[PDB]
């Protein structure tokens, strides 16, 4: 039951403070995704800040 | 088979 | 914990009483290595940045023994499976390879496994545009090396356990690009190996048979799913009869003139040499099939630099673990169907 993926938090770069969680591989660089931000009603970039847990 | 003993009961002598 | 007589100790006790006479004075030398951490080898993924990985590994003071081996192949004088790159540390070196990291191509840079596990692949003698069959493919120690060669147009991988075959798919996805596995070039199936004698008889040119066996290195360490558990005691006794059938099934499936490699991770000749003798006797009497065992002394003479070999073998080649080189234990024999 080796934990190969990790749950990480994605924080918007728009400064709205909106966050959402997604799973990622341990042996990978930090993900900079493009996700919809409900605060600004448009898609903005999200960068990874902290690791939540390992699954 | 523990030793089981019931001592006799004496009725009162007034009867 | 366990009540009494742990399976790890039971395996060691059986090993002691069996290998004391089998190996003589060499038993204490290999006993420590079985009880000591094994030395890992780094097979370079050709689909990844092999040149950069090789350059990176060399900076960690690692040498390509396969590339060194082919250099001495002509020096000593069917060749072997080409375009294979595996890096191992020097004799007596204790450093371990760092965990593999995916490259810019999205595939894993390299794989970590026992070095002796690569020996059956080399002795198979892969040729371009060939057909490869793999009995007991999971978890994919042999299969990944076979796909690194890239000399097989179609590959058939079979293993009984769906759980282990599941992890075989994971390593194939992480290493091999999907387009190579998209077609029927790579085929993964989960049925009994004895059925290949009737499923596709005289079909495959190259077939690799790695029968299940009492893995000496794993038994002395892992405490779960142990072959020496009293519940598996019945299964352990009937291990050779399944091994001789599995070798027979592979010998039936291969085409005449094909090459067969029988490999096992053990040191007892009961599961190494007698099984090979039993299979050739069974085919001669039952199916009237003539098979010739090739001599691999020339194969052995190139590998004493990084490997330790037992020089009292009868039919195959046995690799003994040692403190200087902990690779093994691995046995492999090459035979050709006539």
């Amino acid at each position: 039951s080796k934990s190969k993926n990790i749950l990480v938090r994605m924080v918007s770069e728009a400064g709205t403070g909106f966050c959402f969680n997604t799973k990622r591989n341990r042996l990978r660089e930090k993900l900079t995704l493009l996700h919809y931000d409900p605060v600004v009603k448009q898609r903005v970039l999200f960068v990874e800040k902290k690791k939540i847990r390992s699954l | 088979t523990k030793k089981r003993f019931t001592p006799p009961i004496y009725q009162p002598k007034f009867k | 914990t366990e009540p009494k007589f742990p399976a790890v100790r039971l395996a060691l006790q059986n090993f002691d009483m069996t290998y004391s006479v089998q190996f003589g004075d060499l038993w204490p030398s290999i006993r420590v290595s079985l009880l000591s951490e094994q030395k890992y080898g780094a097979l370079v993924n050709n689909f990844a940045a092999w040149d950069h990985v090789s350059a990176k590994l060399e900076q960690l003071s690692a040498k390509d023994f396969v590339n060194e081996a082919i250099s001495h192949w002509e020096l000593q004088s069917w060749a072997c499976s080409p375009n294979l790159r595996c890096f191992t540390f020097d004799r007596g070196d204790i450093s371990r390879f760092p965990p593999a990291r995916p490259g810019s191509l999205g595939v894993m840079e390299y794989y970590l496994m026992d070095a002796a596990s690569l020996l059956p692949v080399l002795a198979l003698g892969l040729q371009p545009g060939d057909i490869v069959l793999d009995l007991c493919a999971a978890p994919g120690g042999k299969t990944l090396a076979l796909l690194q060669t890239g000399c097989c147009r179609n590959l058939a991988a079979n293993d009984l356990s769906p759980s282990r075959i599941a992890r075989l798919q994971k390593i194939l996805h992480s290493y091999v690009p999907e387009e190579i596995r998209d077609g029927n070039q790579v085929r993964v199936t989960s049925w009994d190996g004895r059925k290949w004698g009737e499923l596709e008889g005289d079909t495959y040119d190259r077939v690799l048979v790695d029968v299940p066996c009492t893995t000496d290195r794993h038994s002395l360490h892992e405490e779960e799913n142990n072959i020496f558990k009293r519940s598996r005691k019945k299964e352990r006794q009937i291990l050779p009869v399944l091994q001789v059938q599995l070798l027979a099934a592979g010998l039936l499936a291969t085409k005449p003139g094909g090459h067969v490699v029988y490999s096992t991770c053990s040191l007892s000749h009961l599961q190494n040499e007698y099984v090979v003798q039993g299979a050739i006797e069974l085919l001669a009497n039952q199916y009237s099939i003539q098979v010739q065992v090739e001599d691999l002394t020339h194969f052995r003479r190139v590998f004493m630099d990084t490997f330790c070999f037992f020089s009292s073998c009868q039919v195959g080649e046995l690799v003994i673990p040692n403190l200087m080189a902990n690779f093994g234990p691995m046995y492999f024999c090459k035979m050709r169907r006539l």
Partner: protein, 95 residues
């Protein structure tokens, strides 16, 4: 449930139901969904959507909660700007 208290001799109230359920004056009970804050990453958006509403209880549960709650919580309240004010009475209910 304490049917007769030792200090006043009157029925008590189970505070467990007060912290978990809301009762409307019409007799309906409003509750949340179990596990609506647990393991949100492994649940589909449709499942998560239907996990975060407020749902009513059936007849047996409503009778169960009424018996465990004294008459104080069954009174009519007139809170200012109460969000659930419109739900305290039933409209167009036949039988």
């Amino acid at each position: 449930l304490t049917y007769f208290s030792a200090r006043k001799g009157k029925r008590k109230t189970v505070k467990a139901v007060i912290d978990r359920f809301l009762r409307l004056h019409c007799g309906l009970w409003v509750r949340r969904k179990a596990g609506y804050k647990k393991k949100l990453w492994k649940k589909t958006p449709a499942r998560k959507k239907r996990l975060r509403e407020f749902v009513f209880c059936n007849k047996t549960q409503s009778k169960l909660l009424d018996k465990m709650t004294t008459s104080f919580w069954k009174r009519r309240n007139w809170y200012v700007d109460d969000p659930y004010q419109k739900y305290h009475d039933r409209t167009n209910l036949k039988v």
